[PDB]
Amino acid sequence: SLPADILYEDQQCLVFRDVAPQAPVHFLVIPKKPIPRISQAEEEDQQLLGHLLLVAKQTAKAEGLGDGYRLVINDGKLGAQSVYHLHIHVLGGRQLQWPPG
Amino acid sequence: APTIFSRILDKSLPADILYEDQQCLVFRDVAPQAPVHFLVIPKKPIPRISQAEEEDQQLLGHLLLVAKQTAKAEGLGDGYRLVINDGKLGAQSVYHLHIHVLGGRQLQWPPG
Ligand SMILES: Nc1ncnc2c1ncn2[C@@H]1O[C@H](CO)[C@@H](O)[C@H]1O
Ligand SMILES: [Cl-]
């Protein structure tokens, strides 16, 4: 993993490639505020959460995902959350299946 | 009207509604992929997340907070998954923005 694997950074968030990718494009959007899980976000996080989704879709465009993609947020053990910090997964570059896990 | 979600919003198609306010509507998915499977949609007919814009920032955050609030109400304390599909490769199918909330079983990886 190299510095260029950070695709985007601002005062609110970091975007970086997943080193265990599940699709030809697979990156991760995280807040800099250490919200551990989406179930523990609060009303004060409204604007931040909206920003994370906008950054996810902006980065998807930058990564050439013009034919579609999937955003995923995992909560807790049943969601298969792998790190207790909020992550938005963005997957693209192949046909995504249904159900989504 | 662009999609069947327009009928859910105007109540001409009866749906199992879990939450409603002036910005969004939450209802059960009629082809559920998990023991709990519901959709959070804006009343503003944004067709796809790739077509959301900066003016939608507040709305988008609100949709996520409503998703997690409703997940709690539905008893998803041991975990759940939120999914937003964009376009054909995302398997979106209905072109009105919606967040899937799935819980009540172990979710697998990869997520499709
Ligand atoms: N009339 C409906 N009521 C609730 N969910 C629906 C309806 N039509 C489609 N969906 C769901 O919306 C998603 C996009 O097609 C799928 O999960 C699908 O089952
Ligand atoms: Cl995760």
PDB file of C-alpha atoms and ligand atoms in Angstrom:
ATOM      1  CA  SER A   1       0.000   0.000   0.000  1.00  0.00           C
ATOM      2  CA  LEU A   2       1.316   3.403  -1.106  1.00  0.00           C
ATOM      3  CA  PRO A   3       0.322   7.053  -0.528  1.00  0.00           C
ATOM      4  CA  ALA A   4      -1.463   7.127  -3.906  1.00  0.00           C
ATOM      5  CA  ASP A   5      -3.847   4.484  -2.576  1.00  0.00           C
ATOM      6  CA  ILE A   6      -5.438   7.426  -0.776  1.00  0.00           C
ATOM      7  CA  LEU A   7      -7.754   8.567  -3.581  1.00  0.00           C
ATOM      8  CA  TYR A   8      -9.121  11.596  -1.750  1.00  0.00           C
ATOM      9  CA  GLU A   9      -8.658  13.395   1.569  1.00  0.00           C
ATOM     10  CA  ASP A  10     -10.210  16.490   3.112  1.00  0.00           C
ATOM     11  CA  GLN A  11     -10.807  17.818   6.621  1.00  0.00           C
ATOM     12  CA  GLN A  12     -13.747  15.426   7.053  1.00  0.00           C
ATOM     13  CA  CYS A  13     -12.729  12.124   5.476  1.00  0.00           C
ATOM     14  CA  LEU A  14     -10.248   9.736   3.861  1.00  0.00           C
ATOM     15  CA  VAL A  15     -10.833   7.557   0.787  1.00  0.00           C
ATOM     16  CA  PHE A  16      -8.508   4.617   0.141  1.00  0.00           C
ATOM     17  CA  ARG A  17      -8.318   1.373  -1.819  1.00  0.00           C
ATOM     18  CA  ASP A  18      -9.314  -1.901  -0.159  1.00  0.00           C
ATOM     19  CA  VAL A  19      -6.271  -4.234  -0.022  1.00  0.00           C
ATOM     20  CA  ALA A  20      -8.640  -7.204   0.031  1.00  0.00           C
ATOM     21  CA  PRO A  21     -10.670  -6.134  -3.006  1.00  0.00           C
ATOM     22  CA  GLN A  22     -13.912  -7.875  -3.901  1.00  0.00           C
ATOM     23  CA  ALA A  23     -14.261  -6.170  -7.295  1.00  0.00           C
ATOM     24  CA  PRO A  24     -11.939  -4.633  -9.921  1.00  0.00           C
ATOM     25  CA  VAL A  25     -12.561  -1.282  -8.245  1.00  0.00           C
ATOM     26  CA  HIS A  26     -13.017  -1.448  -4.476  1.00  0.00           C
ATOM     27  CA  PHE A  27     -12.378   1.490  -2.184  1.00  0.00           C
ATOM     28  CA  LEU A  28     -13.326   2.710   1.274  1.00  0.00           C
ATOM     29  CA  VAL A  29     -14.664   6.039   2.519  1.00  0.00           C
ATOM     30  CA  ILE A  30     -14.084   6.771   6.213  1.00  0.00           C
ATOM     31  CA  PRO A  31     -14.717   9.800   8.413  1.00  0.00           C
ATOM     32  CA  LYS A  32     -11.826  11.341  10.292  1.00  0.00           C
ATOM     33  CA  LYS A  33     -14.148  11.546  13.302  1.00  0.00           C
ATOM     34  CA  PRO A  34     -13.910   8.015  14.731  1.00  0.00           C
ATOM     35  CA  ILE A  35     -17.584   6.989  14.621  1.00  0.00           C
ATOM     36  CA  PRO A  36     -17.229   3.278  15.406  1.00  0.00           C
ATOM     37  CA  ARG A  37     -20.365   1.958  13.634  1.00  0.00           C
ATOM     38  CA  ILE A  38     -23.266   3.445  11.684  1.00  0.00           C
ATOM     39  CA  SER A  39     -25.580   2.359  14.535  1.00  0.00           C
ATOM     40  CA  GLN A  40     -23.635   4.757  16.800  1.00  0.00           C
ATOM     41  CA  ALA A  41     -23.860   7.804  14.524  1.00  0.00           C
ATOM     42  CA  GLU A  42     -25.946  10.635  15.963  1.00  0.00           C
ATOM     43  CA  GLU A  43     -27.987  13.566  14.685  1.00  0.00           C
ATOM     44  CA  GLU A  44     -24.950  15.876  14.930  1.00  0.00           C
ATOM     45  CA  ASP A  45     -23.345  13.689  12.247  1.00  0.00           C
ATOM     46  CA  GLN A  46     -26.031  14.435   9.629  1.00  0.00           C
ATOM     47  CA  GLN A  47     -23.908  16.706   7.434  1.00  0.00           C
ATOM     48  CA  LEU A  48     -20.821  14.510   7.742  1.00  0.00           C
ATOM     49  CA  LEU A  49     -22.790  11.425   6.712  1.00  0.00           C
ATOM     50  CA  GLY A  50     -24.160  13.236   3.666  1.00  0.00           C
ATOM     51  CA  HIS A  51     -20.650  14.366   2.797  1.00  0.00           C
ATOM     52  CA  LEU A  52     -19.359  10.787   2.948  1.00  0.00           C
ATOM     53  CA  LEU A  53     -22.007   9.637   0.450  1.00  0.00           C
ATOM     54  CA  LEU A  54     -21.257  12.560  -1.888  1.00  0.00           C
ATOM     55  CA  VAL A  55     -17.536  11.807  -1.683  1.00  0.00           C
ATOM     56  CA  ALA A  56     -18.285   8.137  -2.397  1.00  0.00           C
ATOM     57  CA  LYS A  57     -20.225   8.971  -5.549  1.00  0.00           C
ATOM     58  CA  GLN A  58     -17.701  11.633  -6.647  1.00  0.00           C
ATOM     59  CA  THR A  59     -14.861   9.137  -6.269  1.00  0.00           C
ATOM     60  CA  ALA A  60     -16.840   6.451  -8.099  1.00  0.00           C
ATOM     61  CA  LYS A  61     -17.048   8.795 -11.087  1.00  0.00           C
ATOM     62  CA  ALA A  62     -13.307   9.545 -10.848  1.00  0.00           C
ATOM     63  CA  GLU A  63     -12.602   5.801 -10.855  1.00  0.00           C
ATOM     64  CA  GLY A  64     -14.616   5.336 -14.051  1.00  0.00           C
ATOM     65  CA  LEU A  65     -17.663   3.589 -12.596  1.00  0.00           C
ATOM     66  CA  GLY A  66     -20.085   5.025 -15.146  1.00  0.00           C
ATOM     67  CA  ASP A  67     -21.991   1.782 -15.752  1.00  0.00           C
ATOM     68  CA  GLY A  68     -22.985   1.275 -12.118  1.00  0.00           C
ATOM     69  CA  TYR A  69     -21.603   0.347  -8.707  1.00  0.00           C
ATOM     70  CA  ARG A  70     -22.610  -0.592  -5.171  1.00  0.00           C
ATOM     71  CA  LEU A  71     -22.206   1.189  -1.825  1.00  0.00           C
ATOM     72  CA  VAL A  72     -22.143  -0.964   1.329  1.00  0.00           C
ATOM     73  CA  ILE A  73     -22.063  -0.153   5.047  1.00  0.00           C
ATOM     74  CA  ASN A  74     -21.681  -3.041   7.484  1.00  0.00           C
ATOM     75  CA  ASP A  75     -22.808  -2.840  11.111  1.00  0.00           C
ATOM     76  CA  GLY A  76     -21.800  -5.318  13.779  1.00  0.00           C
ATOM     77  CA  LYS A  77     -21.197  -9.055  13.618  1.00  0.00           C
ATOM     78  CA  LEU A  78     -24.240  -9.941  11.504  1.00  0.00           C
ATOM     79  CA  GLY A  79     -23.249  -7.249   9.003  1.00  0.00           C
ATOM     80  CA  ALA A  80     -19.710  -8.665   8.792  1.00  0.00           C
ATOM     81  CA  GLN A  81     -18.235  -5.365   9.965  1.00  0.00           C
ATOM     82  CA  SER A  82     -14.481  -5.988   9.969  1.00  0.00           C
ATOM     83  CA  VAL A  83     -13.097  -2.839  11.661  1.00  0.00           C
ATOM     84  CA  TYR A  84     -14.994  -0.832  14.276  1.00  0.00           C
ATOM     85  CA  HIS A  85     -14.662   2.458  12.475  1.00  0.00           C
ATOM     86  CA  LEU A  86     -17.310   3.616   9.975  1.00  0.00           C
ATOM     87  CA  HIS A  87     -16.481   2.526   6.397  1.00  0.00           C
ATOM     88  CA  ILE A  88     -18.480   2.965   3.206  1.00  0.00           C
ATOM     89  CA  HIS A  89     -17.442   0.310   0.683  1.00  0.00           C
ATOM     90  CA  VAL A  90     -17.634   1.221  -2.986  1.00  0.00           C
ATOM     91  CA  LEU A  91     -17.489  -1.712  -5.423  1.00  0.00           C
ATOM     92  CA  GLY A  92     -17.507  -1.614  -9.208  1.00  0.00           C
ATOM     93  CA  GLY A  93     -15.982  -2.851 -12.438  1.00  0.00           C
ATOM     94  CA  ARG A  94     -18.043  -6.024 -12.588  1.00  0.00           C
ATOM     95  CA  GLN A  95     -21.684  -7.043 -12.439  1.00  0.00           C
ATOM     96  CA  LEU A  96     -22.752  -7.035  -8.787  1.00  0.00           C
ATOM     97  CA  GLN A  97     -25.037  -9.904  -7.788  1.00  0.00           C
ATOM     98  CA  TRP A  98     -28.246 -10.035  -5.757  1.00  0.00           C
ATOM     99  CA  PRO A  99     -28.698 -10.611  -2.814  1.00  0.00           C
ATOM    100  CA  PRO A 100     -25.820  -8.399  -1.615  1.00  0.00           C
ATOM    101  CA  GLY A 101     -24.456 -11.055   0.694  1.00  0.00           C
TER     102      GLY A 101
ATOM    103  CA  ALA B   1     -44.668   8.622 -12.911  1.00  0.00           C
ATOM    104  CA  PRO B   2     -41.153   7.218 -13.297  1.00  0.00           C
ATOM    105  CA  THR B   3     -41.383   4.268 -10.886  1.00  0.00           C
ATOM    106  CA  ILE B   4     -43.635   2.134  -8.716  1.00  0.00           C
ATOM    107  CA  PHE B   5     -42.154   3.985  -5.713  1.00  0.00           C
ATOM    108  CA  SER B   6     -44.277   6.949  -6.826  1.00  0.00           C
ATOM    109  CA  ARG B   7     -47.348   4.851  -5.919  1.00  0.00           C
ATOM    110  CA  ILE B   8     -45.865   3.954  -2.567  1.00  0.00           C
ATOM    111  CA  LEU B   9     -45.224   7.648  -1.861  1.00  0.00           C
ATOM    112  CA  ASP B  10     -48.718   8.774  -2.875  1.00  0.00           C
ATOM    113  CA  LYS B  11     -50.246   5.819  -0.988  1.00  0.00           C
ATOM    114  CA  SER B  12     -52.086   4.425  -4.024  1.00  0.00           C
ATOM    115  CA  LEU B  13     -50.149   1.188  -3.499  1.00  0.00           C
ATOM    116  CA  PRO B  14     -50.537   0.012   0.125  1.00  0.00           C
ATOM    117  CA  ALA B  15     -47.143  -0.623   1.683  1.00  0.00           C
ATOM    118  CA  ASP B  16     -45.858  -1.660   5.093  1.00  0.00           C
ATOM    119  CA  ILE B  17     -44.589   1.753   6.186  1.00  0.00           C
ATOM    120  CA  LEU B  18     -42.155   1.879   9.091  1.00  0.00           C
ATOM    121  CA  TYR B  19     -41.396   5.609   9.184  1.00  0.00           C
ATOM    122  CA  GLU B  20     -42.422   8.767   7.359  1.00  0.00           C
ATOM    123  CA  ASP B  21     -41.517  12.448   7.509  1.00  0.00           C
ATOM    124  CA  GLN B  22     -41.610  15.286   5.026  1.00  0.00           C
ATOM    125  CA  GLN B  23     -38.305  14.229   3.478  1.00  0.00           C
ATOM    126  CA  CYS B  24     -38.473  10.436   3.299  1.00  0.00           C
ATOM    127  CA  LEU B  25     -40.451   7.225   3.537  1.00  0.00           C
ATOM    128  CA  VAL B  26     -39.417   3.817   4.890  1.00  0.00           C
ATOM    129  CA  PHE B  27     -41.214   0.619   3.868  1.00  0.00           C
ATOM    130  CA  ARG B  28     -40.705  -3.136   3.764  1.00  0.00           C
ATOM    131  CA  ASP B  29     -39.272  -4.715   0.621  1.00  0.00           C
ATOM    132  CA  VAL B  30     -41.801  -7.088  -0.983  1.00  0.00           C
ATOM    133  CA  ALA B  31     -39.036  -9.393  -2.250  1.00  0.00           C
ATOM    134  CA  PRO B  32     -37.083  -9.594   0.996  1.00  0.00           C
ATOM    135  CA  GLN B  33     -33.533 -10.944   0.927  1.00  0.00           C
ATOM    136  CA  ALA B  34     -33.265 -11.170   4.726  1.00  0.00           C
ATOM    137  CA  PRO B  35     -35.670 -11.708   7.655  1.00  0.00           C
ATOM    138  CA  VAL B  36     -35.758  -7.917   7.931  1.00  0.00           C
ATOM    139  CA  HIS B  37     -35.436  -6.036   4.652  1.00  0.00           C
ATOM    140  CA  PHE B  38     -36.707  -2.500   4.226  1.00  0.00           C
ATOM    141  CA  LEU B  39     -36.063   0.506   1.986  1.00  0.00           C
ATOM    142  CA  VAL B  40     -35.381   4.115   2.909  1.00  0.00           C
ATOM    143  CA  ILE B  41     -36.261   6.502   0.087  1.00  0.00           C
ATOM    144  CA  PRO B  42     -36.297  10.298  -0.338  1.00  0.00           C
ATOM    145  CA  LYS B  43     -39.524  12.013  -1.320  1.00  0.00           C
ATOM    146  CA  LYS B  44     -37.380  14.078  -3.705  1.00  0.00           C
ATOM    147  CA  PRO B  45     -37.191  11.757  -6.731  1.00  0.00           C
ATOM    148  CA  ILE B  46     -33.407  11.549  -7.094  1.00  0.00           C
ATOM    149  CA  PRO B  47     -33.126   8.680  -9.579  1.00  0.00           C
ATOM    150  CA  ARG B  48     -29.669   7.319  -8.626  1.00  0.00           C
ATOM    151  CA  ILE B  49     -26.948   8.115  -6.089  1.00  0.00           C
ATOM    152  CA  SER B  50     -24.638   9.060  -9.006  1.00  0.00           C
ATOM    153  CA  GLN B  51     -27.113  11.870  -9.794  1.00  0.00           C
ATOM    154  CA  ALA B  52     -27.182  13.308  -6.270  1.00  0.00           C
ATOM    155  CA  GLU B  53     -25.616  16.757  -5.958  1.00  0.00           C
ATOM    156  CA  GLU B  54     -24.140  18.970  -3.240  1.00  0.00           C
ATOM    157  CA  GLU B  55     -27.547  20.467  -2.454  1.00  0.00           C
ATOM    158  CA  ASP B  56     -28.613  16.959  -1.394  1.00  0.00           C
ATOM    159  CA  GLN B  57     -25.993  16.649   1.367  1.00  0.00           C
ATOM    160  CA  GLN B  58     -28.425  17.223   4.243  1.00  0.00           C
ATOM    161  CA  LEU B  59     -31.010  14.893   2.732  1.00  0.00           C
ATOM    162  CA  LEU B  60     -28.474  12.104   2.208  1.00  0.00           C
ATOM    163  CA  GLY B  61     -27.299  12.306   5.806  1.00  0.00           C
ATOM    164  CA  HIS B  62     -30.908  12.271   6.933  1.00  0.00           C
ATOM    165  CA  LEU B  63     -31.583   9.085   4.948  1.00  0.00           C
ATOM    166  CA  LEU B  64     -28.658   7.331   6.670  1.00  0.00           C
ATOM    167  CA  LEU B  65     -29.781   8.459  10.132  1.00  0.00           C
ATOM    168  CA  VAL B  66     -33.348   7.302   9.420  1.00  0.00           C
ATOM    169  CA  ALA B  67     -31.921   3.967   8.211  1.00  0.00           C
ATOM    170  CA  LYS B  68     -30.027   3.384  11.442  1.00  0.00           C
ATOM    171  CA  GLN B  69     -32.899   4.675  13.614  1.00  0.00           C
ATOM    172  CA  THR B  70     -35.292   2.261  11.897  1.00  0.00           C
ATOM    173  CA  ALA B  71     -32.775  -0.599  12.131  1.00  0.00           C
ATOM    174  CA  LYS B  72     -32.797  -0.127  15.922  1.00  0.00           C
ATOM    175  CA  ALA B  73     -36.609  -0.051  15.974  1.00  0.00           C
ATOM    176  CA  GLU B  74     -36.685  -3.290  13.966  1.00  0.00           C
ATOM    177  CA  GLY B  75     -34.451  -5.045  16.510  1.00  0.00           C
ATOM    178  CA  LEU B  76     -31.263  -5.248  14.435  1.00  0.00           C
ATOM    179  CA  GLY B  77     -28.986  -4.890  17.464  1.00  0.00           C
ATOM    180  CA  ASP B  78     -26.658  -7.753  16.510  1.00  0.00           C
ATOM    181  CA  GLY B  79     -25.890  -6.094  13.172  1.00  0.00           C
ATOM    182  CA  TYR B  80     -27.129  -5.298   9.688  1.00  0.00           C
ATOM    183  CA  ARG B  81     -26.106  -4.060   6.254  1.00  0.00           C
ATOM    184  CA  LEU B  82     -26.965  -0.927   4.285  1.00  0.00           C
ATOM    185  CA  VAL B  83     -26.770  -1.139   0.485  1.00  0.00           C
ATOM    186  CA  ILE B  84     -27.190   1.470  -2.250  1.00  0.00           C
ATOM    187  CA  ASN B  85     -27.201   0.214  -5.844  1.00  0.00           C
ATOM    188  CA  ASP B  86     -26.326   2.471  -8.773  1.00  0.00           C
ATOM    189  CA  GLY B  87     -27.112   1.627 -12.389  1.00  0.00           C
ATOM    190  CA  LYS B  88     -27.028  -1.668 -14.235  1.00  0.00           C
ATOM    191  CA  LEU B  89     -23.775  -3.060 -12.843  1.00  0.00           C
ATOM    192  CA  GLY B  90     -25.056  -2.217  -9.351  1.00  0.00           C
ATOM    193  CA  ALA B  91     -28.313  -4.114 -10.045  1.00  0.00           C
ATOM    194  CA  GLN B  92     -30.399  -1.034  -9.185  1.00  0.00           C
ATOM    195  CA  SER B  93     -33.569  -1.928 -11.207  1.00  0.00           C
ATOM    196  CA  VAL B  94     -35.815   0.821  -9.739  1.00  0.00           C
ATOM    197  CA  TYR B  95     -34.534   4.289 -10.643  1.00  0.00           C
ATOM    198  CA  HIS B  96     -35.599   6.112  -7.538  1.00  0.00           C
ATOM    199  CA  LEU B  97     -32.836   6.386  -4.906  1.00  0.00           C
ATOM    200  CA  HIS B  98     -33.232   3.806  -2.126  1.00  0.00           C
ATOM    201  CA  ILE B  99     -31.165   2.452   0.740  1.00  0.00           C
ATOM    202  CA  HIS B 100     -31.627  -1.255   1.434  1.00  0.00           C
ATOM    203  CA  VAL B 101     -31.446  -2.248   5.092  1.00  0.00           C
ATOM    204  CA  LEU B 102     -30.937  -5.988   5.649  1.00  0.00           C
ATOM    205  CA  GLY B 103     -30.762  -7.818   8.968  1.00  0.00           C
ATOM    206  CA  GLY B 104     -31.937 -10.743  11.052  1.00  0.00           C
ATOM    207  CA  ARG B 105     -29.462 -13.192   9.473  1.00  0.00           C
ATOM    208  CA  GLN B 106     -25.709 -13.377   8.971  1.00  0.00           C
ATOM    209  CA  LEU B 107     -24.730 -11.302   5.934  1.00  0.00           C
ATOM    210  CA  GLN B 108     -22.020 -12.839   3.776  1.00  0.00           C
ATOM    211  CA  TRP B 109     -18.929 -11.440   2.059  1.00  0.00           C
ATOM    212  CA  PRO B 110     -18.499 -10.385  -0.721  1.00  0.00           C
ATOM    213  CA  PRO B 111     -21.706  -8.290  -0.765  1.00  0.00           C
ATOM    214  CA  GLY B 112     -22.764  -9.678  -4.130  1.00  0.00           C
TER     215      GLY B 112
HETATM  216  N1  LIG C   1     -43.987  -2.553  -4.868  1.00  0.00           N
HETATM  217  C1  LIG C   1     -42.854  -2.707  -4.152  1.00  0.00           C
HETATM  218  N2  LIG C   1     -42.851  -2.599  -2.808  1.00  0.00           N
HETATM  219  C2  LIG C   1     -41.727  -2.754  -2.084  1.00  0.00           C
HETATM  220  N3  LIG C   1     -40.528  -3.028  -2.619  1.00  0.00           N
HETATM  221  C3  LIG C   1     -40.394  -3.147  -3.963  1.00  0.00           C
HETATM  222  C4  LIG C   1     -41.572  -2.991  -4.819  1.00  0.00           C
HETATM  223  N4  LIG C   1     -41.155  -3.166  -6.085  1.00  0.00           N
HETATM  224  C5  LIG C   1     -39.822  -3.408  -6.047  1.00  0.00           C
HETATM  225  N5  LIG C   1     -39.366  -3.384  -4.773  1.00  0.00           N
HETATM  226  C6  LIG C   1     -37.993  -3.641  -4.339  1.00  0.00           C
HETATM  227  O1  LIG C   1     -37.167  -2.577  -4.751  1.00  0.00           O
HETATM  228  C7  LIG C   1     -35.835  -3.083  -5.054  1.00  0.00           C
HETATM  229  C8  LIG C   1     -35.458  -2.604  -6.433  1.00  0.00           C
HETATM  230  O2  LIG C   1     -36.166  -3.323  -7.445  1.00  0.00           O
HETATM  231  C9  LIG C   1     -35.909  -4.613  -4.910  1.00  0.00           C
HETATM  232  O3  LIG C   1     -35.387  -5.030  -3.641  1.00  0.00           O
HETATM  233  C10 LIG C   1     -37.413  -4.888  -4.986  1.00  0.00           C
HETATM  234  O4  LIG C   1     -37.863  -6.061  -4.338  1.00  0.00           O
HETATM  235 CL    CL C   2     -16.693  -3.295   7.123  1.00  0.00          CL
END
